[PDB]
Amino acid sequence: PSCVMDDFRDPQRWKECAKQGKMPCYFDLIEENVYLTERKKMQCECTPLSKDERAQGEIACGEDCLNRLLMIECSSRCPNGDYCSNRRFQRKQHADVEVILTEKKGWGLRAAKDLPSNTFVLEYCGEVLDHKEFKARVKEYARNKNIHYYFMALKNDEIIDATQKGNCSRFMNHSCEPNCETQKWTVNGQLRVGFFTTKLVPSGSELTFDYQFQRYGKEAQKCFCGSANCRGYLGGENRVSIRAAGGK
């Protein structure tokens, strides 16, 4: 079974598909991170493209854009205005990906077209927790006997939790030999995490990243990535404390 990202926009139809096993379980689809506690909180120097350069296919704020080079997105005030290609997170310029049911990892993501190297896939959106809120969620999810975990360290005191609210990025599985990576980008002075391919991903291939998982649980989940260099377990050999996993 597989589904497209537009299938997640209709909660009633999705909930019915989920009951038949044709879609993953329902969660709250969000367009950007939601902070449980709000925290205290830049033009590039690109020369604007002329209309002829735009017509000829020149890229606005491409590889030489100072903001892009520092993993900062441009705002609406960019010298290239509407044409700026460095607003991918804000404009939801996602890769063409489908959500698929895997043999033993749960649901996952696959490329629906060939994806060039260094292509933005999706932003890892969720609820952003502080350390107190994180520990509360650790206990809740352990009490609920959850199998899948969706915590991602954003900063030392910001953990993204995509368990209850997020987007289809929450389906990207771990691989010990991955084809994607996280990148931390600044958008409106705030940090976000996106997934980007690290190589050409052929159409139909599962998209994976290396979680570098910090396991606090007593038991480690076996890794089913299938790589010749598989580490055997999500989290590797060592168990860490809850405090260490949460970034101190």
Binding site: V138, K139, Y141, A142, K145, N146, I147, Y149, F151, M152, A153, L154, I159, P178, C180, E181, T182, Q183, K184, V193, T198, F209, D210, Y211, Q212, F213, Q214, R215, Y216, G217, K218, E219, Q221, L234, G235, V240, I242, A245, G246, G247
Partner: peptide
């Protein structure tokens, strides 16, 4: 001491 759980750590692929 939870049975399962942990935190994903972003890093640049090398």
């Amino acid at each position: 001491a939870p049975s399962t759980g942990g935190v994903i750590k972003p890093h640049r692929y090398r």
